[PDB]
Amino acid sequence: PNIKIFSGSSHQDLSQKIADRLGLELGKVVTKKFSNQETCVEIGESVRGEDVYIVQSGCGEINDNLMELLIMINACKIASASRVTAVIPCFPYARQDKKDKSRAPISAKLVANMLSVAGADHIITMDLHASQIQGFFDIPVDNLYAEPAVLKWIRENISEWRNCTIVSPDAGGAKRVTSIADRLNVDFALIHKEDRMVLVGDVKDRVAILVDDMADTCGTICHAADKLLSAGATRVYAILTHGIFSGPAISRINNACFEAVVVTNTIPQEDKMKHCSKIQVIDISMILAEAIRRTHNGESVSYLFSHVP
Amino acid sequence: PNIKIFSGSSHQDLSQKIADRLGLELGKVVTKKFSNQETCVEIGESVRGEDVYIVQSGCGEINDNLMELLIMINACKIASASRVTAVIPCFPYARQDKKDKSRAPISAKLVANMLSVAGADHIITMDLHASQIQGFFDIPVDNLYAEPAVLKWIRENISEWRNCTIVSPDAGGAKRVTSIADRLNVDFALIHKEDRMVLVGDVKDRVAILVDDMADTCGTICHAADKLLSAGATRVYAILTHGIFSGPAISRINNACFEAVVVTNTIPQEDKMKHCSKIQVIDISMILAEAIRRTHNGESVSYLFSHVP
Amino acid sequence: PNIKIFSGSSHQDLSQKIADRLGLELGKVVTKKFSNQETCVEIGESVRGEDVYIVQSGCGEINDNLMELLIMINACKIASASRVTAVIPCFPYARQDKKDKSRAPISAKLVANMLSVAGADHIITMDLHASQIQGFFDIPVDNLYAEPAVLKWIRENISEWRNCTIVSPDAGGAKRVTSIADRLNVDFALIHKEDRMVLVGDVKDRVAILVDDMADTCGTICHAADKLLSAGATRVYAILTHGIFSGPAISRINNACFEAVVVTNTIPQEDKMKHCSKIQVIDISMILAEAIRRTHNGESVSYLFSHVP
Amino acid sequence: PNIKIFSGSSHQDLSQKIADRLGLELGKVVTKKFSNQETCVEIGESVRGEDVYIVQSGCGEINDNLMELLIMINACKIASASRVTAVIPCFPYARQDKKDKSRAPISAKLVANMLSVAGADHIITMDLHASQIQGFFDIPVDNLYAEPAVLKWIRENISEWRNCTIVSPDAGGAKRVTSIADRLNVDFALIHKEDRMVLVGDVKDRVAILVDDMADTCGTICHAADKLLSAGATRVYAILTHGIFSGPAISRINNACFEAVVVTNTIPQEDKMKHCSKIQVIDISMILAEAIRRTHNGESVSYLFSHVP
Amino acid sequence: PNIKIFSGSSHQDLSQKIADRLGLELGKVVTKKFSNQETCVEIGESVRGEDVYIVQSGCGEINDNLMELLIMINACKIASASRVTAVIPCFPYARQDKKDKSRAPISAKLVANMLSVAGADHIITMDLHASQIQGFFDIPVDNLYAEPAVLKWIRENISEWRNCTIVSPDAGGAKRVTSIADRLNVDFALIHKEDRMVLVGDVKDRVAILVDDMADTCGTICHAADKLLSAGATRVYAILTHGIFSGPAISRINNACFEAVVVTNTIPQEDKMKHCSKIQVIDISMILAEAIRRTHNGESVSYLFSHVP
Amino acid sequence: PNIKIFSGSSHQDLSQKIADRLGLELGKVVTKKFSNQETCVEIGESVRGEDVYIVQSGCGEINDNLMELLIMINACKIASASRVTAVIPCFPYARQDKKDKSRAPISAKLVANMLSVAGADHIITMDLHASQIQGFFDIPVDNLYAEPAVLKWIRENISEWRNCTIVSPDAGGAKRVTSIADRLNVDFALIHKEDRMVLVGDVKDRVAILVDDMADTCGTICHAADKLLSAGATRVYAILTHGIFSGPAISRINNACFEAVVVTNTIPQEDKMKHCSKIQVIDISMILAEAIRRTHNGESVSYLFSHVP
């Protein structure tokens, strides 16, 4: 059983980078739309008794990409692939992980069920919005962390990183920032809204680094950055693993005080970089490639939680 | 347990017509998109211990509508609805019902599995592309027929209907046309391609009526109509239950010789009627409403296979 | 189909209170242990075509109680009960809701799967540790809130409640306290550890109210209370929905500065009240009884999220 | 994991031919009936961690053979076989693949469900009546084609094959005949009933070859052959992949004008050949053996769609 | 939801008796075989939202009857019956309930799985060979007992029943006979083979009554009766709930010393009574009818374990 | 894929013996309880693509051990183990294998379902109380037999074994004793209660050996031994595969006339041996180790039914 890497249409550059790091050519697949907008998928090579990895992120036209992924999984499964793994760098509907006093769907659970029923045997993803989403599956889920790469970026790009403060934009992400604050041996601050925001932790004359899983409309991080500049911070950075940047995010970032907005490339960023000078990208394709290769060879994946490969 | 009718965004006029025929107000639901294009659904009323019917056709932005339907089904199911029924007038991915010497998905089966796993207890649909799709489910599926309404339209709109010929555009649909030919006591002709088409059955000086389940790009029916005019037909009609009309269909129909292109309203047609004079619509909302009401009251649904209500 | 209420051995007083509020006698069931410690269950009355509710909390001998609940659910399901609902005021293994860089089980998901496979059709619980646990199920889960009752207790027991500060012991619970702070129109403070704790929000000369879902060993709330007294608070209260109080919790509370430790009665408290003077109990049996009665009658349960019955 | 081939009682000659082509001895199994006609199965060798293939066609006493197959699959699955494959040359109940305005079962779907629940991991079959039956499964299904062998037989047995006409007995099979007509570069004709039949396509002074999936009572092909002789055909052949030949088929064929009735050996034919001189058999055991060997070795099976091995 | 009773072809007299006791007409169903011996089923009336009971015993052509039952269950389930119950007086493959050091199927479990996957919601049966078969299902199973009727027959037909000895033919059935011996206040004897049999318990000058679940070939009961006459018994009776009587059973019984061979009518007996004078039948249709009526009305079924209705 | 052996807390000595016989070190796992008595499990080594065997018997604190086993299975399954096998020497709740005229659970079936849903692929157990429990699973179950070892013990410890009588304590176990009686060529006796017991078979001046699957309270075997001494037996032995010895068993055995009470070590016995001189243990770790090694290597397991390794 050999590795076969197939790309969905969502993020072809990432799939190519992963394929090069694996020393493979991207599997031959045709993924387009019929005239009536139904997703047309044709696997261009035999996947029999192979270990198939399908790379597709929850970005762009999310429902189209999700249906493409499900259809590709189904095609590979009924084509007698030995094992089918969904490599989903940004998990779609991850923020709909609970109901919370609303007659709402748990869309993340629905997506997990659909992936399972399509025939996925394994999920590889990066920085799930809530790690409880792992429990939405009955198949194994490897939730990788961009932190090795975020810490690397911070050390090699922020000269004052030893005196910086890692800041959570909200009470929800505090855990994450504390983890980072522990690995850098720096202070960590929290910010919560009461339209006013309250900040705990000295940030005067120090570089502040907001950290988060995802920036969609960037209202949260822009408000946090305004508050950080109010409290005497020298420069404010924002580091996010998922740069969705939908709606007015680009205009708000352009009007914000960020020195840089660093995001990983779980979502393609070339178009946003054109219209926003201060967006920067941290490659995490090495982490994804190493996770694929370790799942294939039966080596430890959790080794990657703390080690940059 | 009362009837609750909810509309997806795909076909709101049809949902309203069904609700009026049932004497009900469309259930309160908010169905929109978040900024990052994730489907947001909020059920605006309690559906506890109710018999819920969600109307959504496989039309327009098909993957968006399908995800909306799945999310709404899930929301109603975890909101403790007694029973959830998907009313899908045009079934999405119905034409992907087999592999046939290709490493292709069976997308119709995947859609059926997704509907089942979302929590659908029952499916109501009209003129499935292949009735074998009923076997793709383990829940009951009521496949209604537009034929009572097509026959009604033919009798009240084609003055020469007793001397007409019902024509299949291809060998696949012959069964359907024979059924119609049996109910009208008229001749039936077949047309098959060898770029040339061959026609069996006298059509000279007689009105010809092409009959089909769906017109997507209308290449099939336009070629058939050209052949029918070649063979001395007086006028050529086309009657389809699903008027998808994607791609170049409107231009081809405008350049074709059809007297009329009659389609049912399983798919909204107002925009296409603006740009195509010869499109006409047969209301099938009475059949759908009667099917809903009979499933709710435990009356016979198959009664509708031969009776216009 | 009538309501049948059955009690497990974990919390018989709560089951009796619920049964009285429903106007019913607790269903006849024998729930003991064989000599070799296997759980013996005998349903002492017919539950055919009935709506069965089994009350069992995740308290005391947790694995014994959980097995008792699963066995009782199975017995009622194969005895042809029309519907079986598990009323689990404190959900066992709720804190094991994720893996988080550890080769650990997701025990909450396993418990959810076991409840589903035993035959539960519905779950009623109170203040799930993480509401994402709702997504661990495919059956509906009603997660009730003790907040109506906590707010009631605060208003009728703390004379200075209009000038109090609601305090989260950690960053994780902030959401909860903010909700309470919104419903009372008071300030809210956070406390997070860096062995030192940092507090944001003025608490001097004001009554502070720590709020949390559960107190197991009470290290968290005792450290938070010490910090609150350090920061000039006048009195410190602690309000928790689940009073587990295992290990050294009673000694720590006795040595702590709390004016009172208020817990709901999702877990029996009589033994702990004997050895701890400052423990007080808020009855939530009215909320549970109303939820049972509303699920049975098909009325809105979410009405209870904001209304004390 | 080694190949183990087991024979049901339906077609032991085919199983032996397959076993010889694989270089194996048929697995030791006892498959008989108890006195009260219950199917008795005993696997006479260990199948642990083996790749098991059970050969059983839908022929003869169909329900007995189907139950034998299900029981053998179950026995191998609970005996810890690594993988169990059902090799079903003629799929039972394949013609019951839809309801079609009747309160009828979809028996093909029921058979698929029973095969899945018995523990089949994979299905190998030949010329499914409708390829949509593939979607009735969630396990992979390899639907082989007898066409490589039919084309071979036509070329080596019909001297005038370059000037022949391939004829469909009905509108349903036209696809199949067109495929054959494409591979031979000959004309293709259709025949449909209006008790009268209508034929499209010149057949005068040319050899006609009716092609079909199955001959049960042979009314269809006998009527088609009568019509072909009416239209001036020189000789009429019939080629079917499944020679069921039940009821009056042998008498009708004996009284018909066929030069030959060629069928594959998916169903044993020795008894029918005794009473019908013009029946001939095309061996497809090489295709089945190659499919088994390619599924075992992870080679491409679809290679066989166009290549005679 | 009303009761609909449908008969399979196995035991139509029993179905009619049950229907008369329920005050109903047997549901209209056509259950025959196509020419190629595939089971043809057509439900002749609407079963929507009805409580459907299908009566079919594991007798005669067992695999044909079992497939008929599965097909009828499937037809009723996809016809939107509210509930489908299989009434199986004699459960097929019940004696294949374990492997026991053999590479054998557990055919009873396979049958249970097939019944569940066909869509059965409930099973009613009489005197399961092993009551552990109840655990082979996840749906409720009501295993009725013929004992009320056997005890009634013994009292009204054996004048010396107060001084009789109830005898088990083997060690396996001892439980059953002890139950009967307890309800009659008589002695109970066991018989086990060492070709020789050993008997424990005085039987001289006393009437002996062998009791068993089923007589297939009657070797067991004939050997037991020979031994009982050897040990000085006055008359020997045999009472069995299931009179299969396959193979040489009728000849052996005719050559045996039994005063009578009483069997219930879970299996039709008219043909066997023609060739065997000493076979007598105990009607259990009242027990089955009462069980159906009590499951429908939600009354206690276990009431029937000790009460003749 | 390598063998990984993990021990639950129930029987660590047995797990160590098995690991030594396999030439392996017990897998690193932490299995303890949190303060609130929730089971804490941490797999201390990678189990990716490994063949995992978890050893845990149904002994001691049965519900705690069962939950530990389920949690460990779940942890290994979501840690991407290639295969997970539960090695359960004494199966918990095995005696609750049927309902039998009681509104009781089938707890053995519930345990089987829980093991399957936790992710077990395979079960290895010894002397199931009823072999029908094998049918409670859909995964393969290997039910080993202690008989090779019991026969070995009898021959090497009872000098008069050629003239002994093997005695069943009840009618239920007769099969077992007959098997042993067949392998030793000795007489076999039965004992059944009518508070009085009746014995069939000469036992005077002969050594009697009671044989059974399990001794829980030892009332059965103590009453049987009293009866055997009444009937002139010289010495009475008891041999059981499962020595549970709960409740008053030790006192009753101490007051009984047994020469020895031999049990296997499926359950730890060191504590009971301290208080009971006549308990002796037969090691069956060789059978379990050989079964593990044969399932891993794909060799025949049933070879062990008759051969001591």
Query: DSSP string spanning chain B?
Result: --EEEEE-SS-HHHHHHHHHHHT-PPP-EEEEE-TTSPEEEEE-S--TT-EEEEE--S-SSHHHHHHHHHHHHHHHHHTT-SEEEEEESS-TTTT----SSSS---HHHHHHHHHHHHT--EEEEES-SSGGGGGG-SS-EEEE-SHHHHHHHHHHH-TTGGG-EEEESSSTTHHHHHHHHHHHT-EEEEEEE---EEEES--TTS-EEEEEEE-SS-HHHHHHHHHHHHTT-S-EEEEEEE----TTHHHHHHHS--SEEEEEBTS--HHHHHH-TTEEEE--HHHHHHHHHHHHHT--SGGGGT---
A295 to chain F: which residues are within 8 Å by CB? Answer: 48, 80
**Which residue reads 């005792």 in tokens?**
C222
How crowded is residue E88: how many other Cβ atoms within 10 Å of its Cβ? 28
For residue E28, give the 3-state DSSP assignment. coil
Encoded tokens for B28: 């309160």
Is E104 in the D-facing interface, judged by CB distances under 8 Å?
A: yes
Tell the residue number behind the tokens 């699963």, with chain if given: C70
Q: Which backbone phi and psi does B125 adopt, to 5 degrees? A: -145, 170
Q: Are F213 and F240 in contact (CB under 8 A)?
A: yes
Query: What burial class does residue E157 get, using C-beta atoms within 10 Å of its C-beta: 0-12 exposed, 13-18 middle, 19+ buried?
Result: middle
Is the Cβ of D137 closer than 8 Å to some Cβ of chain E?
A: no
Token code pair at residue E171: 């060690």
Phi then psi for residue B288, to 5 deg, are -65, -45
Distance from CA of B32 to the nearest CA of D (A): 33
- Cβ distance D46 to F295 less than 8 Å, yes or no, reads no
Q: CA–CA separation, F136 vs E106, rounded Å?
A: 10
Q: Does the annotation place B96 within a ligand binding site?
A: yes
Mutate to test the interface with A, among B36, B43, B77, B111 (most CBs of A within 10 A): B36
Technique used to solve these coordinates: cryo-EM
Return the SS3 of C142: strand
Any chain D CB within 8 A of the CB of A49?
A: yes
Neighbours of A44 (CB within 10 A): 11
Q: CA–CA separation, D228 vs D257, rounded Å? A: 10
Q: How far is A63 from chain B (nearest CA, A)?
A: 6
Tell whether A192 lies on the interface with C, counting CB pairs under 8 A: yes
Q: Which residue of F has its CA nearest to A141?
A: F78
Q: F100 vs A52, E133, F172, CA distance in Å?
A: 50, 11, 15
Mutual orientation of helices F62-78 and C62-78 as an angle, nearest 10°? 90
- How many other C-beta atoms are found inside a 10 Å radius of the C-beta of residue D249? 24
The token pair that represents C214 in the structure block: 């559960």
Tokens of D140: 């992979």
Cα-to-chain-centroid distance, residue F70: 19
Distance from CA of B187 to the nearest CA of D (A): 8
Specify the residue for token string 């020997």.
E236
Q: At which residue do the structure tokens 């659909």 appear?
A: A114
CA angle, D222 then D224 then D228, to 5°: 115
Q: What residues does each domain of chain C span?
A: 1-145+283-303, 146-282
**What span, in angstroms and rounded, lies between the C-alpha atoms of F175 and E172?**
8
Tokens representing F280 are 């002796």
Question: Whole-angstrom Cα distance, residue B258 to residue B212?
Answer: 14
Nearest CA in chain B to A70: B110
Beta bridge partners of E214: E242
- Is any Cβ of chain A less than 8 angstroms from the Cβ of F71? no
Cα separation, D7 vs D268, whole angstroms: 14
Q: Which is it for strands E187-193 and E197-200: parallel, antiparallel or unpaired? A: antiparallel
Cβ <8 Å between F48 and A300: yes
- Whether residue A97 is annotated as binding a ligand: the answer is yes
Helix, strand, or coil (residue F70): helix
Closest-CA residue in chain B for D105?
A: B135
C129 is in an annotated binding site: yes
Phi/psi for C251 (5° steps) reads -65, -45
D-chain residue closest to F122, CA distance: D80
Tokens of F123: 């079960």
Q: E71 and chain B: CB distance < 8 Å anywhere?
A: no
Q: Which of residues 150 through 169 in chain A touch B, CB cutoff 8 A?
A: none
Contact across the interface for D140 and A49, Cβ inside 8 Å: no
Residues in C closer than 8 angstroms to F105, CB to CB, are 41, 71-72, 74-75, 78
C141 part of contact set with chain B, CB < 8 Å: yes
Mutate to test the interface with D, among B96, B97, B101 (most CBs of D within 10 A): B101
D99 annotated to bind ligand: yes
Give the span between the Cα atoms of A290 and A17, in whole angstroms.
12
What is the number of residues in chain A?
Answer: 309
CB proximity C2 to E under 8 Å: no
Q: Do B104 and A35 touch (CB under 8 A)?
A: no
Dist CA D218 CA D198 (whole Å): 18
Is A230 within 8 Å of chain D by CB? no
Which residues in chain B touch residue D133, judged by CB atoms under 8 angstroms apart? Answer: 132
Tally A–C CB contacts below 8 A: 87
**CA distances to B33, D195, D197 from D252, in Å:** 65, 17, 18
Answer yes or no: do D99 and B131 touch at CB < 8 A.
Answer: yes
C-alpha D186: how far from its chain's center?
25
Residue C162 marked ligand-binding: no
| Residue of A42, A107, A216, A251 to mutate, testing the B interface (most B Cβ within 10 Å of its Cβ) | A107
Interchain proximity E122–C80, CB inside 8 Å: yes
Closest CA to B104 of A75, C41, C93: A75
Burial C128-146 (b: 16+ CB within 10 A, else e): bbbbbbbbbbbbbbbbbbb
Closest C-alpha among C239, C238, C240 to residue C227:
C238
Which residue on chain F is closest to A295 by alpha carbon?
F48
Across the interface, of A35, A43, A62, the residue whose CB is closest to B216 is A35
Cα–Cα nearest to F88, from F127, F42, F117: F127
Q: What is the DSSP string of A77-140?
A: HHTT-SEEEEEESS-TTTT----SSSS---HHHHHHHHHHHHT--EEEEES-SSGGGGGG-SS-
Chain D: closest CA distance from residue A96 (Å)? 29
Rounded to 5 degrees, φ, ψ at C129 are: -55, -45
Q: Which residue of C has its CA nearest to F59?
A: C36
Radius of gyration of chain D (CA): 20
Which of left, alpha, beta for F247 (phi over 0: left; psi -120 to 50: alpha)? left
**D62 contacts chain E (CB < 8 A):** yes
Q: What is the DSSP letter of A163?
A: G
Helical (H) or strand (E) element with D204:
none
Q: How far apart, in whole angstroms, are the C-alpha atoms of residue A126 and residue A128?
A: 6
Cβ of residue B80 closer than 8 Å to a chain C Cβ? yes
Are B183 and B147 spatial neighbours (Cβ–Cβ below 8 Å)? yes
Q: For residue A184, what are its two tokens? A: 């850098």
Instruction: Inform me whether the C-beta atom of residue E26 falls under 8 Å from chain B C-beta atoms.
Output: no
Q: A46, B82 in Cβ contact below 8 A?
A: no
Residue B74, chain C, CB below 8 Å: the answer is no
Which of E37, E100, E102, E136 to mutate to test binding with chain D, by most D CBs within 10 Å of its CB?
Answer: E37
State how far Cα B80 lies from the chain centre: 30
CB contact under 8 A, C305 and A201: no
Nearest to B80 among C134, C138, C140 (CB): C140
HSE, side-chain direction, 13 A CA sphere, residue E53: 30
* Residue contact B246–A37, C-beta within 8 A: yes
| D131 touches E: beta carbon within 8 Å | no
Tokens 């290990």 correspond to C247
Whether residue F120 lies within 8 A of chain D, CB to CB, comes out as no
* Residue E162 DSSP class: G
At residue B262, φ and ψ (nearest 5 deg) are -90, 130
Distance from the B45 Cα atom to the nearest Cα atom in chain A, whole angstroms: 8
Q: Provide, as residue numbers in chain D, all residues whose Cβ is less than 8 Å from the Cβ of A1.
A: 298
- Contact between chains at C130 and A132 (C-beta distance less than 8 A): yes
Q: Which chains touch B (3 or more CB pairs under 8 A)?
A: A, C, D, E
Contacts of F65 (CB under 8 A, 6+ apart): F8, F9, F10, F56, F57, F58, F59, F92
Tracing tokens 């050893």 back to the chain, one arrives at: F55
Nearest to B101 among D101, D198, D305 (CB): D305
Task: Answer for the pair E79, E117: CB distance below 8 angstroms, yes or no.
Answer: no
Tokens of C110: 């396993």
The answer to whether residues B86 and B119 touch, using CB atoms and an 8 Å cutoff, is no
Those residues whose C-beta lies under 8 Å from the C-beta of residue B226, and which sit 6 or more positions away, are B256, B257
What's the first-to-final CA gap in chain A, in angstroms? 24
- Estimate to the nearest angstrom the gap between the alpha carbon of A15 and the chain centroid: 14
D182 is in an annotated binding site: no
Q: Which residue, among F42, F45, F46, F116, would best test binding to A if mutated, counting the most A CBs under 10 Å from its CB?
A: F46
Largest CA distance in chain B: 61
Report the distance separating Cα B83 and Cα E75, nearest Å: 20
